[PDB]
Short mmCIF file of C-alpha atoms and ligand atoms in Angstrom, two decimals:
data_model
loop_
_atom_site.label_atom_id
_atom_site.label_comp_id
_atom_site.label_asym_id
_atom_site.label_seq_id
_atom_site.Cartn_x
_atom_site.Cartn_y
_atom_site.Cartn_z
CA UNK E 10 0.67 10.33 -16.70
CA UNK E 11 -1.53 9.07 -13.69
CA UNK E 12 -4.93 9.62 -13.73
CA UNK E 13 -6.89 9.20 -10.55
CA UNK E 14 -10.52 6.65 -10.35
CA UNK E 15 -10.13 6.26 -6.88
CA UNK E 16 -8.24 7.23 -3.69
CA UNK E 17 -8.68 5.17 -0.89
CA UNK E 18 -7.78 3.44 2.57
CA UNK E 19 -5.78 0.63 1.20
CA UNK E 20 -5.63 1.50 -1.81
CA UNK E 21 -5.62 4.03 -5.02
CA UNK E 22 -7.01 2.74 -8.64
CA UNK E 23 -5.36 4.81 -11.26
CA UNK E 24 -5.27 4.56 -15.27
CA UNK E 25 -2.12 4.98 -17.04
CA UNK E 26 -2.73 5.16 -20.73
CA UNK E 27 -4.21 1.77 -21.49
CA UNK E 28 -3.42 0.60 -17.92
CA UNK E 29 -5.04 -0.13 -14.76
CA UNK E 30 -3.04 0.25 -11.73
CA UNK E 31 -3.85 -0.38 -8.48
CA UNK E 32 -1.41 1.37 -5.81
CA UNK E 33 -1.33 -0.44 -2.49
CA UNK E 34 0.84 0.18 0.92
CA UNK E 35 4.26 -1.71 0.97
CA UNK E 36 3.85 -4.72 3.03
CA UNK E 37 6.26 -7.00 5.34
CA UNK E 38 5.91 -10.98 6.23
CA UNK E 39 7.59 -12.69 8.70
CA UNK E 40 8.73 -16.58 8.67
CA UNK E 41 9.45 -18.43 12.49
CA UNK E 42 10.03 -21.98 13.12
CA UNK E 43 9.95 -22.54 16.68
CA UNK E 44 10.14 -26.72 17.69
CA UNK E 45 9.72 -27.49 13.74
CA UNK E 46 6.87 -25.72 13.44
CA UNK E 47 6.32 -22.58 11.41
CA UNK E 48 4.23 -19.57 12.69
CA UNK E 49 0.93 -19.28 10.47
CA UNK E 50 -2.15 -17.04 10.83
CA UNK E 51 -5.24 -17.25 9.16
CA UNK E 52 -7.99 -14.71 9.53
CA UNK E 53 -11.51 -13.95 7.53
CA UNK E 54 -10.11 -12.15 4.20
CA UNK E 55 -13.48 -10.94 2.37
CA UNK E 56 -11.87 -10.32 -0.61
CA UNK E 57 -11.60 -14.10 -1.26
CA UNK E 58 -14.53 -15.47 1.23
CA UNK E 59 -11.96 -17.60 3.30
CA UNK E 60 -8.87 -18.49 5.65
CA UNK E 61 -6.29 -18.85 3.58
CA UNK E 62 -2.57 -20.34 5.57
CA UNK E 63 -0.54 -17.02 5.74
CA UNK E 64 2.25 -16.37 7.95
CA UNK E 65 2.49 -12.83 10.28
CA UNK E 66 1.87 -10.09 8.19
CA UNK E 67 1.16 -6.34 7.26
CA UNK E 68 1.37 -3.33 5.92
CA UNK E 69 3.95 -0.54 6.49
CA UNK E 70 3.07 2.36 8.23
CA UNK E 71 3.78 5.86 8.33
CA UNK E 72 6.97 6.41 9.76
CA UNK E 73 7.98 2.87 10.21
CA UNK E 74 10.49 1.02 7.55
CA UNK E 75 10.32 -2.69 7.06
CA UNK E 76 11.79 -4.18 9.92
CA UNK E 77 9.80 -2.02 12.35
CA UNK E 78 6.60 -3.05 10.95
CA UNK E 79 7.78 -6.68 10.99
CA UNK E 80 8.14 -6.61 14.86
CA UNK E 81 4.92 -4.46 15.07
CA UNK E 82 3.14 -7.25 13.20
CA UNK E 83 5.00 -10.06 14.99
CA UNK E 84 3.74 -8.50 18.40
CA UNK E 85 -0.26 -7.63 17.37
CA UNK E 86 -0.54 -10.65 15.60
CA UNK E 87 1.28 -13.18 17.94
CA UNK E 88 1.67 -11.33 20.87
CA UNK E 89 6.10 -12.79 20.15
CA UNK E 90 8.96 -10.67 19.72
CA UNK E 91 11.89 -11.88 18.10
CA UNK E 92 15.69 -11.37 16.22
CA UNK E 93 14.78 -10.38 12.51
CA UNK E 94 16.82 -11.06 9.92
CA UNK E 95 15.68 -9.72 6.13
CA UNK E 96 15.83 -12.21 3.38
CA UNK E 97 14.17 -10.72 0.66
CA UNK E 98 11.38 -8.87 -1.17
CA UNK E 99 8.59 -9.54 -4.00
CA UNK E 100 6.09 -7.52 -5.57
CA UNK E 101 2.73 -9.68 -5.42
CA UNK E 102 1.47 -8.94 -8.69
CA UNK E 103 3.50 -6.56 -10.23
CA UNK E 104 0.87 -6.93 -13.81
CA UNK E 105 -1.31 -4.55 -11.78
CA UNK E 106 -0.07 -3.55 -8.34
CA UNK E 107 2.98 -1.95 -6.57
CA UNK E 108 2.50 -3.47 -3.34
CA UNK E 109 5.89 -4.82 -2.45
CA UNK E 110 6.57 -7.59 0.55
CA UNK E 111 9.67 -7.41 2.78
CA UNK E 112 9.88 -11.27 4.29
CA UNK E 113 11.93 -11.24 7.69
CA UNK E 114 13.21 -14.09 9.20
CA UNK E 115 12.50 -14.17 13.43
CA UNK E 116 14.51 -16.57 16.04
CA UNK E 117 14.21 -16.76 19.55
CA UNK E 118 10.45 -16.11 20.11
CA UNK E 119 9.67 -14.55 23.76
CA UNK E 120 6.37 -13.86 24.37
CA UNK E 121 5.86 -10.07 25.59
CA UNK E 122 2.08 -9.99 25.16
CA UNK E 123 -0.64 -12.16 26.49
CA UNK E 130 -9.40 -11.87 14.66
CA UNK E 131 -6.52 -13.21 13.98
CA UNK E 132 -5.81 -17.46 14.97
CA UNK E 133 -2.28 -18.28 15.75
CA UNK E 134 -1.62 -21.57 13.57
CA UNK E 135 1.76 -23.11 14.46
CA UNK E 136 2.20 -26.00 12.11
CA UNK E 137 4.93 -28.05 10.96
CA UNK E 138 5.22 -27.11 6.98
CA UNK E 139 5.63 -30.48 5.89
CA UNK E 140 1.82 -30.87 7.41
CA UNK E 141 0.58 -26.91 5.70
CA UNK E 142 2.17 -28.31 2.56
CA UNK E 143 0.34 -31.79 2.62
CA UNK E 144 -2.65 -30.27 3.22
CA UNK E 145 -2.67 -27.69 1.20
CA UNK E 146 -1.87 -30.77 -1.52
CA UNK E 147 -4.83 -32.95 -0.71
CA UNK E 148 -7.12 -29.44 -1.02
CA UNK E 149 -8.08 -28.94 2.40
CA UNK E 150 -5.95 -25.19 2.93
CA UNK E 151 -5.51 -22.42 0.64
CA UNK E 152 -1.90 -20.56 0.92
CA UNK E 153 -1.17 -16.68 0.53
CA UNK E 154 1.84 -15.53 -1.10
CA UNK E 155 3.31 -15.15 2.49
CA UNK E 156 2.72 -18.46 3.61
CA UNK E 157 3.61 -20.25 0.57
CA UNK E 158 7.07 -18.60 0.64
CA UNK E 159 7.12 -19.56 4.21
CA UNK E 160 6.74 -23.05 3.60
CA UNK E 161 9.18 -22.92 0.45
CA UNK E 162 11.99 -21.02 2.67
CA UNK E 163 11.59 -23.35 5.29
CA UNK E 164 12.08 -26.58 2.95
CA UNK E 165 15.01 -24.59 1.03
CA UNK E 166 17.19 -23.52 3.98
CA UNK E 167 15.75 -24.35 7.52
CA UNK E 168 15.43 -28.23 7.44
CA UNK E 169 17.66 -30.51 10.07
CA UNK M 10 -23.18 -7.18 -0.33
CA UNK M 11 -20.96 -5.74 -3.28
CA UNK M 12 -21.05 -2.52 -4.70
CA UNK M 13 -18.90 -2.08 -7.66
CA UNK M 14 -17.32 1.77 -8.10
CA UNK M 15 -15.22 0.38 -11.80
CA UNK M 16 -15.53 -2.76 -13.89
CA UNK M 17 -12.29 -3.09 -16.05
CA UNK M 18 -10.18 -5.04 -18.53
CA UNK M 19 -8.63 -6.86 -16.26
CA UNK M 20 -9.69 -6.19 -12.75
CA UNK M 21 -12.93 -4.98 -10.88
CA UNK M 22 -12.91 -3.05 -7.84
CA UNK M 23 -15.94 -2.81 -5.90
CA UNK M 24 -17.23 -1.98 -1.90
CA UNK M 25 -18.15 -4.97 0.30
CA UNK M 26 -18.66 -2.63 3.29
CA UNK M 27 -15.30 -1.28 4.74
CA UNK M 28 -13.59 -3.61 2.61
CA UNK M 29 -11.57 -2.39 -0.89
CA UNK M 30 -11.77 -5.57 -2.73
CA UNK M 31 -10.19 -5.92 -6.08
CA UNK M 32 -11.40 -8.45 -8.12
CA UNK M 33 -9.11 -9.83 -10.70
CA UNK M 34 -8.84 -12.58 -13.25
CA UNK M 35 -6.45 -15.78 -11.69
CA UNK M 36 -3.48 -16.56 -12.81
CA UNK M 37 -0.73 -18.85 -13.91
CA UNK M 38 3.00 -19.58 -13.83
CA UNK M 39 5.52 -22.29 -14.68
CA UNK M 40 8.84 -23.07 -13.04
CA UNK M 41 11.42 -24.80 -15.97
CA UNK M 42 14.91 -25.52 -14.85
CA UNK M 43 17.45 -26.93 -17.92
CA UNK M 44 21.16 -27.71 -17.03
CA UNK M 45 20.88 -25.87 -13.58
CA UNK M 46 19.09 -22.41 -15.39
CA UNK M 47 15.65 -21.17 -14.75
CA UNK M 48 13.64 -19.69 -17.23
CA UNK M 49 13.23 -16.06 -15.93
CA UNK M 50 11.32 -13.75 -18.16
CA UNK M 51 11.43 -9.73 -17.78
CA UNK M 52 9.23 -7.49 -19.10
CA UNK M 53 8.46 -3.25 -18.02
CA UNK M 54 5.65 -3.64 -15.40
CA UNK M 55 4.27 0.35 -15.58
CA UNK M 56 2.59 -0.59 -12.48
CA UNK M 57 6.11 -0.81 -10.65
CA UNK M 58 8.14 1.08 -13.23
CA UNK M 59 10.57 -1.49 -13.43
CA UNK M 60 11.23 -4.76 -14.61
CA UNK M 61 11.43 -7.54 -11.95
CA UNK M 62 12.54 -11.26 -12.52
CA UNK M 63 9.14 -13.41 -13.08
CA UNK M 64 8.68 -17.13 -14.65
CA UNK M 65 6.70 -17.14 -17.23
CA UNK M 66 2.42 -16.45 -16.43
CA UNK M 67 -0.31 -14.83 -17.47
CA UNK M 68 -3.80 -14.90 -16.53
CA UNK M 69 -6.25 -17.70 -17.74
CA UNK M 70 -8.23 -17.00 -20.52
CA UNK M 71 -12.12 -17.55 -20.94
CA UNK M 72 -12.81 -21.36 -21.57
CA UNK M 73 -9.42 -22.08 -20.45
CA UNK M 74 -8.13 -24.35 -17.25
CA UNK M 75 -5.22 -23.78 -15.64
CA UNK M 76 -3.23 -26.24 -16.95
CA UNK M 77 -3.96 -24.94 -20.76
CA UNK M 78 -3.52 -21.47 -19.66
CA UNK M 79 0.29 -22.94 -18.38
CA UNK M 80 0.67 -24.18 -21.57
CA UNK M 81 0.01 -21.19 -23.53
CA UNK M 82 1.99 -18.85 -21.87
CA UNK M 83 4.73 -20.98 -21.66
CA UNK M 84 4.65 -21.06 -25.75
CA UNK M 85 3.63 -17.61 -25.80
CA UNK M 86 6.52 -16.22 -23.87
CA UNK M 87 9.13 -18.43 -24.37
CA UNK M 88 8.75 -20.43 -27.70
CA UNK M 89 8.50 -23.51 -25.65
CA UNK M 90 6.53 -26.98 -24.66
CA UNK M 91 6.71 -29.20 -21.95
CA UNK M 92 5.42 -31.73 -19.72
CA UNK M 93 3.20 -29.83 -17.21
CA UNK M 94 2.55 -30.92 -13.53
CA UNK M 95 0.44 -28.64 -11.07
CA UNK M 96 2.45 -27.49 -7.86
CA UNK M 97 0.12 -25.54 -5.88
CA UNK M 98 -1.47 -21.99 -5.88
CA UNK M 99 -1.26 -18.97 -3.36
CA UNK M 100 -3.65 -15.78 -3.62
CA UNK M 101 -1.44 -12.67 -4.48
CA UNK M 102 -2.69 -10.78 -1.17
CA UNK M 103 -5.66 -11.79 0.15
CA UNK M 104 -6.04 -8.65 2.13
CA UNK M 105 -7.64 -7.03 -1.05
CA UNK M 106 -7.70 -8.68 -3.94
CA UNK M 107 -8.52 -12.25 -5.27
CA UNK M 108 -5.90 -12.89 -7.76
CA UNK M 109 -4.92 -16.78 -7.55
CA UNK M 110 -1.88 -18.10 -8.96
CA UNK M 111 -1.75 -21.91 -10.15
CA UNK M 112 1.71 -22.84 -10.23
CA UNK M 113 3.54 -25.71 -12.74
CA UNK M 114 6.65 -27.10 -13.15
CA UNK M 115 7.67 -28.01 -16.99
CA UNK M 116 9.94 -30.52 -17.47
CA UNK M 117 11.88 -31.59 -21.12
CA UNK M 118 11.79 -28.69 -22.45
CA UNK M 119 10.95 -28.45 -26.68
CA UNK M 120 11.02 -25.51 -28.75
CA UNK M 121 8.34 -25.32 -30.75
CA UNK M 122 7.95 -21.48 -31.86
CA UNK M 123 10.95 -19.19 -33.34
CA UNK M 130 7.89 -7.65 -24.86
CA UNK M 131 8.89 -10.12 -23.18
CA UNK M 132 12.94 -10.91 -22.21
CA UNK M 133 13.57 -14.79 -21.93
CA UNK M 134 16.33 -14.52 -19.00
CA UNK M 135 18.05 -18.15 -18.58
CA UNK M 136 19.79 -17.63 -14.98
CA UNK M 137 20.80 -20.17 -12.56
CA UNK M 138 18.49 -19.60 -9.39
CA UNK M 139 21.84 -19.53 -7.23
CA UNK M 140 22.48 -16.58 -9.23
CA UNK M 141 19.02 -14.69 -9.27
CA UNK M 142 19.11 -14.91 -5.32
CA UNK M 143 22.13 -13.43 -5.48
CA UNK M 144 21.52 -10.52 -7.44
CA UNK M 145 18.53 -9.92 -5.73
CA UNK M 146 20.33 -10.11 -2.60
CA UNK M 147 22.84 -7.48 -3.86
CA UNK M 148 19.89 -4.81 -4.75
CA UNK M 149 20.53 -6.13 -8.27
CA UNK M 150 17.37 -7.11 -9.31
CA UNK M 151 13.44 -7.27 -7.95
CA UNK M 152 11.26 -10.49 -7.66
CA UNK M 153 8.02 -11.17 -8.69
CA UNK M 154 6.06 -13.39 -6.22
CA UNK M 155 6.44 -16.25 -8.72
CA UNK M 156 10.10 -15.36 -9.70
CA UNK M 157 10.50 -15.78 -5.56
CA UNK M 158 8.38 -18.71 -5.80
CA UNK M 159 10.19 -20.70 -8.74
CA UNK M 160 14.33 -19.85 -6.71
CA UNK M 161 12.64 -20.92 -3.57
CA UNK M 162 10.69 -24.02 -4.98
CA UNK M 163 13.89 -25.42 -6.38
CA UNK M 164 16.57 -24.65 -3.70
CA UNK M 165 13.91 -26.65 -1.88
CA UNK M 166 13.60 -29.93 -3.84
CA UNK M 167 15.23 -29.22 -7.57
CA UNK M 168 18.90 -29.88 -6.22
CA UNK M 169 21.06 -32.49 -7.51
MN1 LIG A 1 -6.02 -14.08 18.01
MN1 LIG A 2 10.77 -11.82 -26.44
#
């Protein structure tokens, strides 16, 4: 049975028996290379006290599924609409959290619109400096970067 | 300024203004291919009522670095040693909490020790189910299929 500490905006904290659970809003990501360069964002996170490299992102909202949010995010985020593709999904931390990501491929950008800095970067570069300390990824751009070496390269 | 509303076992959460922030211990977890299989583990996740595909992780321990913390859960899950060497790290979701994941790949593989499933699977094969509707992902079971379709081939 779930018992209720808190019910909030982004999230509830609940105990079930020994366990502390943490329900959060289902989430999409979305991955573009445009030129060789991948799509990032970075924006003030407070709950770490930095930028990390992240790639388009947010959370579902009521009424929308998956690929609806991903062009909603896509647009507010990047002012770019695109064709999505899904590739896959991942729960985040699934020792203490539901939140689940949807990751969505988008080709041929337009832009239809004219917080949050747009970061195009070419992945090899993210991933090198990421190596030599000087970025911090999110899950979302870290799969980025891995999808793009795995499958988008040439 | 944070204002804490619970202080748990194995995450805080607390009010820095508007923001939900949860804090939570970081984390580790280790890639290991052997004669084209990852090592997958599975275990029941109550927080997501299933069991998705993970590598084997764990959060570090007090007096521990990341690299020991590897180690351990790598023997602790699996029976096994190896020869550890850092990847990277990603925070979970950086939109509210500040998990961080240090990721390792193990290479020659030892057993060293006669809840947790070990699940040998090629990663051809765990993209596949997951694909299908098969099976979930963990963000480091998505990490560790994407990390060596990128550069584990051959
Ligand atoms: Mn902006
Ligand atoms: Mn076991």
């Amino acid at each position: 049975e779930r018992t209720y500490l808190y019910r909030g905006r982004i999230l509830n904290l609940a105990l079930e028996g020994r366990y502390e659970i943490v329900e959060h809003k289902p989430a999409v990501a979305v991955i573009a290379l445009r030129e060789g360069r991948m799509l990032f964002v970075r924006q003030m996170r407070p709950a770490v006290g930095l930028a990390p490299l992240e790639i388009p992102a947010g959370l579902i909202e009521p009424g929308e599924d998956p690929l609806e949010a991903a062009r909603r995010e896509l647009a507010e985020e990047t002012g770019l609409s695109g064709d999505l593709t899904y590739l896959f999904s991942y729960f985040v931390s699934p020792g203490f959290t539901d939140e689940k990501t949807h990751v969505f491929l988008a080709e041929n950008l337009k832009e239809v619109e004219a917080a949050i800095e747009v970061v195009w970067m070419r992945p090899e570069e993210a991933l090198e400096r990421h190596q030599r300390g000087e970025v911090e990824f999110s899950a979302t751009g870290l799969v980025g970067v891995l999808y793009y070496h795995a499958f988008l390269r040439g």
